[PDB]
Every structure is written in structure tokens, then in C-alpha cells.
């Protein structure tokens, strides 16, 4: 299937284009709300600022791909693997993505003139897996995190206020000038370097974490 | 004996036992009180000001309200000793001029409402000293054993508490948001404190 049909078939209204291959297709700014494309194969496909809002997306591969600036709010995104794709700009506010695969992905970017965060405010990515992703200025605003692995991600000047990261793994997680505001760190696995940088006025944490805290800062026990 | 009100400026009295002596407003500037027995003696609110007093035995001395604001008095005994109300530090507008003492024995002693700003307590023993209302502004505490300390209310604004020992003392809030602790040894429940102390939720 190419462009010039899967525009003719959302042009007459289907919205069933599961398992469909869809590899490297051309879709730069189409709309393609509400569509049903789980399981579908968009490997390396170009998505830039490509309209999704509410499409279902669940066991979608999406690997390699550019999504940079596309609207992905309220999309299905649970168990997709997105290893790989470019979501600089995008937004996936509310987006599910329980389970789903983010490693080596770029969610942000510093230009010389500023940083470009993608939106994922209150997106739900319980048990995602975002180890090595680079999440520069990324706004995860009360976005949740519960058992996320993170390790190792890039945390740079990125909002995560008023976020769940229970059970999280940030080891090896660059957190330098990132905003926890408020957020639930109880159980999770962080370096000593997140307590000397991220902003923590209001974070939930527990006793053993408290005090790795204060031994981050040289107080001796 | 009695020797209230003395004027002995300048006057060198190294190693006298001047104990249980009645030394109330006496004015001891720059006096070399070296290694002088001063235990249980009443000097509060003389002047001290200056005076040499190394290595002098002034255990259990009331020296409430003296003036000891540049004063020698590297390695006193002063345990149990009353020194309320002290004059140990003074900010001039030049700057501040406090008092020397490296390696005192301040155990049990009683601090409360004592100016200390810019005191060089460099490695004092303060076990169970009471700093209640204690202005510690810009005051050198450095390996100095603070257990069972109480420094409720004290001021601690610029003060250096690196590789100190602050086990079992009760302090406020705001003096782990203000003095340096780089290597400070602390308890379980005031490493907690210390992390509510900037913001953490329990």
C-alpha cells in the first residue's frame, strides 16, 4: 500500500488499516485522526507534523521513525516500538504508552537559540522502557512513570513536575536543571547525582531515600 | 578573696590560681591570663577583650555577659561554664572580630543568648553545650564535637560546620539550609530532617 491509496481509502473513510505495511511511506503533514492502526509496520516512516490525535497505535512498530512535531494527543500507544523515532516537537499529550518501547529515542533537543521539548503532559508510560533516550526539555508535566526504566536518559532542562516515578530505574540518568516539583520518587533507583541537581521542592520519598539525599550533600552516617 | 572592678590593662598574670575569685566588672583587657586557674570564679561582665587566656582552667566560671570579643583562649578549659549573654563576636563595619577558640572544652557549658559571630571554634569539644538563641553568624565550627547540643534558635548564617560532629544535637531547620557540612557526622532522624529541611514530603 503507498501514499496515494491510503490517502483515497481516508478520503472515503476507512479506518482499518491493521497489520497493514506502511514502511518509509511519505505522510509529512496528513491527517489521519482516529484511525485503527495497531499492529501496522511504520518502520522509518516520515510522520513530520503528521496529525494522529486518538489514533489507535497498540503493538505499532515505529522504530526509526520522525515524528517530530506530529499531534499524537490521545493516541493508543501501549507495547509500540518506537526505538529509535524522532518525536522532537510532538506532542503526545495524554498519549497511553503503558509497556511501549522508547529506547535511543530523541523526545528533545538544544538548539543554540533554545531547547525544544516534546509535550507529554500527563501521558501515561507505566512500565516503558526509555533507557537511553535523550528527553532534553521534554515536558512531562504530571506525566506517569510507575517502574519506567530510564536508565541512563538524557533529563536535561525537562519539566517532570508533578510526575509519577515510582519504581523507576534513573541510574545513570542525566537530571542537571530538571524540575521534580512534586513528584513521587518513593521506590524508584536513582544516582546520587539527581539529589544534588533536580529541583525536589515537594518530591515524595522514602526514609532510605532521604537520607541518600543527605549523604549526597557529604553528611556522613 | 575579693578583686572586683581591678583595673589590670595590659597586666601579666600568667598562671595564677585566681580561683573561686570575685572578678565582677573587671577590666582585664589584653591581661595575659595564661594558663590561669580561673575555675569557678564570677567575671561576668568584665572585659576580656584582647586578653590572652591559653590553656586557662575556667571550668564552671560564670561569664555571663562578659566581653571576650577578640580574646585568646585557644584550648580552655571552660567546661560547665556559664558564658550567657557573651561578647565572643562583634561585625564592625570593617568587619568581623571574634574570639579564638581552637580545641576548647566547652562541655556542658551554657551558651545561651552568647554573641559568637565570626568565633573561631576550630575542633572544639561542645558536647551537650547549650547555643539556645546563639548568634553563630560567619563562626569557624570545624570538627567541632557538637553531641547532644541544643541550637534551637541559634543563627547560623555563613557558619562552617565541615567535618563536624552534629550526632544527637536538636537543631531547627534553617541551620541545614544555611552552614556548610561537607562531612558533618549526623543521626537517622536528622539526615530526614535535613532533606525536609529542603522540601522532600515523608
Given at each position: 500500500m503507498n501514499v496515494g491509496e491510503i490517502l483515497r481509502h481516508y478520503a472515503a473513510g476507512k479506518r482499518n488499516f491493521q497489520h497493514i505495511n506502511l514502511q518509509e511511506i511519505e505522510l509529512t503533514n496528513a491527517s489521519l485522526t482516529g484511525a485503527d492502526l495497531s499492529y501496522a509496520n511504520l518502520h522509518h516512516a516520515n510522520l513530520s507534523r503528521?496529525?494522529?490525535?486518538?489514533?489507535?497505535?497498540?503493538?505499532?512498530n515505529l522504530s526509526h521513525a520522525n515524528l517530530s512535531g506530529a499531534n499524537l494527543e490521545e493516541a493508543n500507544l501501549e507495547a509500540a516500538n518506537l526505538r529509535?523515532?524522532?518525536?522532537?516537537?510532538?506532542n503526545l499529550s495524554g498519549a497511553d504508552l503503558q509497556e511501549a518501547n522508547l529506547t535511543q529515542a530523541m523526545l528533545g533537543q538544544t538548539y543554540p537559540w533554545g531547547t525544544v521539548g516534546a509535550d507529554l503532559s500527563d501521558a501515561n508510560l507505566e512500565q516503558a522502557d526509555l533507557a537511553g533516550a535523550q528527553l532534553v526539555g521534554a515536558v512531562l508535566d504530571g506525566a506517569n512513570l510507575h517502574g519506567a526504566n530510564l536508565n541512563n536518559a538524557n533529563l536535561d532542562n525537562?519539566?517532570?513536575?508533578?510526575?509519577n516515578l515510582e519504581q523507576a530505574d534513573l541510574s545513570?540518568?542525566?537530571?542537571?536543571?530538571?524540575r521534580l516539583d512534586?513528584?513521587?520518587?518513593?521506590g524508584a533507583t536513582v544516582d546520587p547525582v539527581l539529589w544534588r541537581t533536580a529541583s525536589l521542592v515537594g518530591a515524595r520519598v522514602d526514609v532510605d531515600q532521604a537520607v541518600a539525599f543527605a549523604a549526597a550533600h557529604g553528611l556522613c552516617l
Open positions: 503528521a496529525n494522529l490525535r486518538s489514533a489507535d497505535l497498540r503493538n505499532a529509535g523515532a524522532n518525536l522532537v516537537g510532538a525537562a519539566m517532570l513536575t508533578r510526575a545513570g540518568a542525566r537530571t542537571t536543571g530538571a512534586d513528584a513521587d520518587l518513593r
